Design a protein around this ligand. Structure first.
Ligand SMILES: CCN(C)S(=O)(=O)Nc1ccc(F)c(C(=O)c2c[nH]c3ncc(-c4cnc(C5CC5)nc4)cc23)c1F
Lengths: 249, 239
């Protein structure tokens, strides 16, 4: 059992619900603050716990246990540092290419691991990628996994979710790394992007990628961003490629 | 199941000695090949040990990732960058802040194991890996090194308290920067002297927090029952 007997966790400050806590060291706790969970609230809990229970990988957020009796709660490791979103989009400090490649590799290993276990993340984005101690990638925020608009494949815009969708979202994450920007800087209208990406009249501007960016990465990026879902690569190939060029330079 | 099918793991360089290898499996892994052809008698003795590692989910405990049974029995875990606490301490200057942090993390790992009712039985500086030279990873809990052995172990010999004694020796390593009884280079003497209670580590060789030394002395008690529990150990180190 991964059920942590309640009263063993010293809950602390709020983060966003999620609390930093104390349980044999630093932990993070996601507490559903309801009086009595909906039948839907219960299955969402069981599902997230069931999928977390099957993950043991350094690039996946470490699940540590759950609580049921007082409230629904999911306990994971405590990550120090910020999300990839914050580092790229909301911070002055920008990364060297070698690290950007490394961040890409670590994410791909995690995604490759998940897909090997028949798990679709369905919400991969730079915000769900935690740079633990600013070096080690941790894929997390597992609210929707099974067994955010800018990171959506056209067939998710228009079951839409698949391994292929996870690949597209990973493609956008790559675009973030290699540009430092979010896709569609021109568009400020939600419903415009939705229609345009959905139709296939729109795609990320790969001309914006850094001059340093290896052509191998740029090519791969384009592949993961293919509008036809079945034309997109699988993570074994994605990881292989990223691994190839990482050694290459 | 956590069994990794035959072939999925690509084995690389021999790291040390079952036998440990670096490998590839959805990224880097470490593969410990067991000194084993397996009999049905040994198979369910092997899975018994995996079932213990199966219930460890903690950042300061080396991440168990899965096992193999073909071609041979193997434990698969995460790969750690950098070297053990032993190598840093006895083969190559941590600021006191980091030493305490290293001590802090080991207590977290141990406290967790004991809460999970798991006795390590072999805690020591070389079973404490420094991943990225920051994060402590405790492994190897699934003739011998006697420096970390509690007096009751030498002569329920293996208990939570004997783990605490081992941690004490580890605290001593961190604070002195050297192994106990360096003055005496004789296993048989150490075995006899520590076993009979006539010898204990020399605390004259420890800028060390005086609460730490008290705690270190508390862990190093020859009397098994005079030793604190890890929750108390963790609480005092944390504070
Ligand atoms: C999870 C705990 N278990 C199930 S268990 O069975 O209790 N313990 C257990 C199991 C399997 C294992 F591979 C290991 C293991 O040894 C390592 C696991 N990850 C590693 N990462 C790096 C290293 C390493 C690299 N290089 C050097 C020298 C500098 C050259 N020293 C060390 C060793 C390992 C293990 F400790």
């Amino acid at each position: 059992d991964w059920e942590i007997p309640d009263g063993q966790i010293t809950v602390g400050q709020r983060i966003g619900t999620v609390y930093k806590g104390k349980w044999h060291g630093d932990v993070a706790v996601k507490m559903l603050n309801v009086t009595a969970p909906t039948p839907q609230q219960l299955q969402a809990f069981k599902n997230e716990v069931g999928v977390l229970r099957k993950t043991r990988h350094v690039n996946i957020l470490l699940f540590m246990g759950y609580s049921t009796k007082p409230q629904l709660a999911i306990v994971t490791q405590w990550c120090e540092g910020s999300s990839l979103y914050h580092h790229l989009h909301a911070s002055e400090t920008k990364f060297e290419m070698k690290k950007l490649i490394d961040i890409a590799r670590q994410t791909a290993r995690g995604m490759d691991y998940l897909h090997a276990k028949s798990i679709i993340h369905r919400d991969l984005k730079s915000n769900n990628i935690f740079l633990h101690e600013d070096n080690t990638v941790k894929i997390g925020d597992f609210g929707l996994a099974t067994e955010s608009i800018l990171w959506m494949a056209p067939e998710v815009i228009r079951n839409p979710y698949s391994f292929q969708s996870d690949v597209y979202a990973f493609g956008i994450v790559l675009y973030e790394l290699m540009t430092g920007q979010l896709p569609y800087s021109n568009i400020n209208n939600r419903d415009q992007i939705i229609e345009m990406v959905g139709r296939g009249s729109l795609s990320p501007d790969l001309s914006k990628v850094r001059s340093n960016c290896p052509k191998r990465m740029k090519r791969l990026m384009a592949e993961c961003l293919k509008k036809k879902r079945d034309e997109r690569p699988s993570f074994p190939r994605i990881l292989a490629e990223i691994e190839e060029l990482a050694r290459e330079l």
